């Protein structure tokens, strides 16, 4: 390694830290799992103290939290709003329905896991996961973002 590689590595940390520290999820919730998402924003857990702020516009969002069941009728709309998030963007699959169809896995009308529609960064189990379990998954996304090495990889190309 070299001082040019050291500088690149410290810059990766800085840009990674900025995206860790200001994760703005879309105002986007599908079913009962969204109720526990409200409880993560509520005072006991206060997601906003970690820097997590809902914004309704996909253009102003970084994270999609798929919080509930994804039906076939809903699937194109979810794909649309994912595509309209500017990058870098992340997806958190929350709950059994989003994770793999859950209680409705065998239904004619249900997508068996949102990871058939969008890429998923974190899978949060539970039906619903508790507000705390969701918060744990959000903090696992932050640590994943902490591991991104995009500038180091650019330098070595």
């Amino acid at each position: 390694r070299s001082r040019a590689e050291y500088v690149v590595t410290k810059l990766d940390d800085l840009i990674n830290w900025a995206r860790r520290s200001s994760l703005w999820p879309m105002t986007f919730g599908l079913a009962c799992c969204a109720v526990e998402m409200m409880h993560m924003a509520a005072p006991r857990y206060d997601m906003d103290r970690f820097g997590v702020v809902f914004r309704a516009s996909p253009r102003q969002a970084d994270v999609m939290i798929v919080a509930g069941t994804l039906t076939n009728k809903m699937a194109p709309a979810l794909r649309k709003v994912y595509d309209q998030m500017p990058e870098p963007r992340y997806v958190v699959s929350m709950g059994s329905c989003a994770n793999g169809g859950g209680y409705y896995h065998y239904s004619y009308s249900v997508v068996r896991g949102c990871d058939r529609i969008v890429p998923v960064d974190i899978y949060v189990p539970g039906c619903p996961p508790t507000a705390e379990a969701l918060l744990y998954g959000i903090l696992q996304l932050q640590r994943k973002i902490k591991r991104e090495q995009k500038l180091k990889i650019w330098y070595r190309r």
């Binding site: 996909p58 979810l78 649309k80 595509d83 990058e87």
Partner: protein
Amino acid sequence: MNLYTVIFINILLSLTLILVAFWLPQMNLYSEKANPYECGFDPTSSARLPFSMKFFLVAITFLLFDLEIALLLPLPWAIQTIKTSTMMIMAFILVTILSLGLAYEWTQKGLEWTE
């Protein structure tokens, strides 16, 4: 010169932030990303079609009321006149007729938005 200098710096700072914001980030342009937003479904028409204005009468009343205040903004210089009684009557009459105009439009339901 100073006012020109600072406003140019203000323009200069704003344009630099725009250039940074457009040339620093990684891009990934594709059609679905750049299509107009409408809550996940496609728009059914252009946003350029007529959009009805229900307060159009208040809007053109505002044009006249904005020239009324233009007639009022010399008042700080006008109160320096020797002809205090004349100035006072002119200002009182001007404000009163504007009030009567507003009162008439109010009672004609001109401030109610159209349905």
